[PDB]
Structure 1
């Protein structure tokens, strides 16, 4: 027995805040969290406790420490079948990673609609407010490999597998409402341009290189999503604090056959929140797994990520009433023109057991729709339908990928397909064809109907010649980037300018920079001049005379496009760093932890070493991490309680901890003699907005601090940070 007698090796099977316990597989951490999909996976789950170590053939292994050899110092013998099996499996562990979105993090949950949508869709999972549909959701980046970092500047993926009673429905979206390109034929072109360059495979997880901006400068259709990626949208605080969109216009079909155009939205319950770039870039080095960890730990804490599903709904006769083409995925539908209507809510409440088996092997594909839903002629969606079935043949080893447990439907599935690599199902049907008499033609077709019917495509009208040709209605590239730009706050605009500037500064060929600046001058001259200034470029008089693009159906801004314009913050699930000293004033800490617990805010107690310290009243305080081990990048605010401040007053890591949080605009709270730290951040004796300070942490100290946290960051501090050396 190698476990410790005190049993401290096993985490408790109950919700615990991040860092209190070792993380564990979901069925062990929360065995009583169940749904119909989790239960169906029990047949393939494998335990371990009280079992013998065997080969894959069931043979008990006596000595798992040594190869078989001719003498204890002799050659290894080919007849060691236990070695060779163990090494063979190891030698073939890896499978191809996803072509795009290879880096991702996933969890189980459930979905439930608010009310029956049977008036607009016959889709069964939206027909009754009491119908609960299990889900599996994978969040992702786009460009980086499976081993790349979480907090890069990138688009994020948001893929939801609905295990419906009438088929698997995959909603395969991103965290922005549009994509970079218009036609699927260009997808390898765009992806090759953004991916690491083919001679040397640099850089990983970054669009800040020549070939990406080269493609953008020559393809202005890309400009809208590029705007989004250069904003703080491209660097989310977590997957819980981002939006989701299906991007394409789809169709809803009701029992009477009426089609309604629809676009899908996920609204985060935790609000919209993003990092700032210096923080996001450094965090890819201090913790490349930050988003993966934060997701797992929130679920282990009970901080279940929640999202409200919503629809923008457009009648068929309104197809042409907007300036933009509904079928153009580089165009958004402003919520000011078509509101998002609440449909239901999704809760992610259990982690997987084995990342490889459940996350890496999961297969999402937007062609996986159910009766009540249908496609449109969006030329990007159209080509997606081919790719997501095709790519699985190599990634997941063949055509039986639906038999891998995480991908199996929970509803019945029967047909006349047979064979293929690693076929699990053993068909007893006398027939493998239809029409057949020898099994009385079963399984049988089902006619279309209002529920439990067969799938039939909406009989939309088609008219035109066979052409490789872009619809002229698509050939407008600058109005929607402008609408986005004007909808941002001034500090969000600053960050957009700084994103473009930082990225173009790493383009080596200067003529590429100049061509991207010229495209910006077609969007907004304020934006283009600000970027040009940082690049040492001067706009020509002709460029200064570029007429701006028209408004979007009269709109000159839409505050739903901004992260922060309308407050939607939420402190539940946020984390505060508490910086300890060797004789902490316990009255401060008790007030701090009481206020944080009331709002569901977590705390990390940090010191210069691990182990424990003792407060003034003798209370023993366990240390979560060092100052260097858990930098301010990983928390939302910093609190410094009173006590023996001289212990850390001249500690470089303690001082830098506050300087980093200050530069990154986070709230900071100083109690008693901890107010001496204002000098390291150059805060005058009069104080300033964003620095909570008082004689002690009792009173309004923590309400000021929690109000600041509900506002996410202290945007008013931005003029002051450029003098801070951090």
Structure 2
């Protein structure tokens, strides 16, 4: 899939980045017990590379894991959307998905209590389409300008950077109690949804109302819902705590293993579809990201199958 960019090092002699054969095990010195020389370019190119390996972690959802897969459309959905990846029964589009926690840094534990990310890229034949979702259908806040306030409050206190990957501290609850919009996502996070058994055992939600637009220009309002075929399942809190200690890599290992063993996880990619006229018909505003549309009011339509079946080759690059 990304075959063209792969580099193989199963044979051959060590070279610099400009293809000159070299060694990299001993520094060049003025005498066998002497000082290292500035002219040692082998040393400097290798160490400069190493010194510069790291990039900033993501400002949120720093901790996560991904895989490649395929999306297959169940129908020609031309009658609700012009979207090319949805325009024929059986049409296949490559995907890449990254799942994550939200608050913790790189290296924090998979099984912390948190909102989880479920970000999906469809490499469509009319361009990349991303649905950047969470495992919880609603968000804490109603205006993007408040994001840094929310995130500062739930991340570690800035004098001592304590506590890692946890809402269990004064600042977060101060924010929650002063900003009552947070109540809905709070209740989800405090349920089993905050500690899922695996990435495969949770759903994905776009959260926002988006629009499907036909080629004739007519539109409908939609909510994205990726429905897990593995079922839903959570940990219990005491278990999640011990797991955070025994295996910080629990979720990424789970996903990696299911893929290697030929049990790639699957989701039905679904939408709730409603009319433009129904923006305020359900007793709340569809522009409000703290609300769900009860399934009693709008059933889910299954658009296609998302299957993840191939692990990355290099975690950093992918």
Shared topology, TM-score over 0.5? yes
Match of 1:292 among 226, 248, 252: 252
Mapped contact 2:279–2:287 kept (Cα < 8 A)? no
In 1, distance between residues paired with 2:110 and 2:154? 17
Match of 2:9 among 29, 43, 48: 48
2:266 corresponds to 1:306 = yes
Larger Rg: 1
Offset, 1:58:
0.8
- Alignment correspondent of 1:127: 87
Q: What SS does structure 1 have at the residue aligned with 2:316?
A: helix
Offset, 1:220:
0.7
Q: Deviations over 1:359-411 (max 9, x none)?
A: xxxxxxxxxxxxxxxxxxxxxxxxxxxxxxxxxxxxxxxxxxxxxxxxxxxxx
- Alignment correspondent of 2:30: 70
For residues 524-673 of structure 1, the aligned pairs below 5 Å read none
In 1, distance between residues paired with 2:278 and 2:293? 13
Q: Deviations over 1:307-349 (max 9, x none)?
A: 1000000011222211110110001111111111111001100
2:114 corresponds to 1:154 = yes
TM-score under structure 2 length normalisation: 0.99
- Alignment correspondent of 1:224: 184
Offset, 1:231:
0.5
- Alignment correspondent of 1:171: 131
Q: Deviations over 1:38-66 (max 9, x none)?
A: 1xx222100012221111111111x4321
Offset, 1:130:
2.6
Q: Deviations over 1:475-497 (max 9, x none)?
A: xxxxxxxxxxxxxxxxxxxxxxx
Q: What SS does structure 1 have at the residue aligned with 2:305?
A: strand
Q: What SS does structure 1 have at the residue aligned with 2:111?
A: coil
2:159 corresponds to 1:199 = yes
In 1, distance between residues paired with 2:53 and 2:132? 27
In 1, distance between residues paired with 2:92 and 2:48? 43
Q: Deviations over 1:13-48 (max 9, x none)?
A: xxxxxxxxxxxxxxxxxxxxxxxxx1xx22210001
Match of 1:59 among 20, 31, 39: 20
Match of 1:82 among 42, 48, 61: 42
- Detail structure 1 runs of 4+ shifted over 6 Å in the superposition: none
In 2, distance between residues paired with 1:130 and 1:75? 66
For residues 286-435 of structure 1, the aligned pairs below 5 Å read 286-358=246-318
Offset, 1:257:
1.2
In 1, distance between residues paired with 2:178 and 2:242? 31
- Alignment correspondent of 2:150: 190
In 2, distance between residues paired with 1:101 and 1:49? 34
- Alignment correspondent of 2:224: 264
Offset, 1:145:
0.6
Q: Deviations over 1:235-255 (max 9, x none)?
A: 000000001100000000012
In 1, distance between residues paired with 2:122 and 2:106? 24
Q: Deviations over 1:113-143 (max 9, x none)?
A: 1111100000000010131100000000000
- Alignment correspondent of 1:213: 173
For residues 16-55 of structure 1, the aligned pairs below 5 Å read 38=1, 41-55=2-16
In 2, distance between residues paired with 1:287 and 1:325? 42
In 1, distance between residues paired with 2:169 and 2:63? 20
Q: What SS does structure 1 have at the residue aligned with 2:70?
A: strand
Structure 1: tracts of 5 or more residues without a match: 1-37, 359-726
Q: Deviations over 1:457-511 (max 9, x none)?
A: xxxxxxxxxxxxxxxxxxxxxxxxxxxxxxxxxxxxxxxxxxxxxxxxxxxxxxx
2:109 corresponds to 1:109 = no
In 2, distance between residues paired with 1:151 and 1:69? 49
In 2, distance between residues paired with 1:90 and 1:145? 21
Structure 2: tracts of 5 or more residues without a match: none
2:234 corresponds to 1:274 = yes
In 1, distance between residues paired with 2:118 and 2:82? 24
Q: Deviations over 1:279-325 (max 9, x none)?
A: 00110000000001110011000011101000000011222211110
For residues 419-568 of structure 1, the aligned pairs below 5 Å read none
Q: How many residue pairs get matched?
A: 318
Higher helix share: 1
Q: Deviations over 1:656-701 (max 9, x none)?
A: xxxxxxxxxxxxxxxxxxxxxxxxxxxxxxxxxxxxxxxxxxxxxx
In 2, distance between residues paired with 1:238 and 1:125? 28
Offset, 1:203:
0.7
TM-score under structure 1 length normalisation: 0.44
In angstroms, what is the RMSD of aligned CA positions?
A: 0.7
In 2, distance between residues paired with 1:243 and 1:77? 57
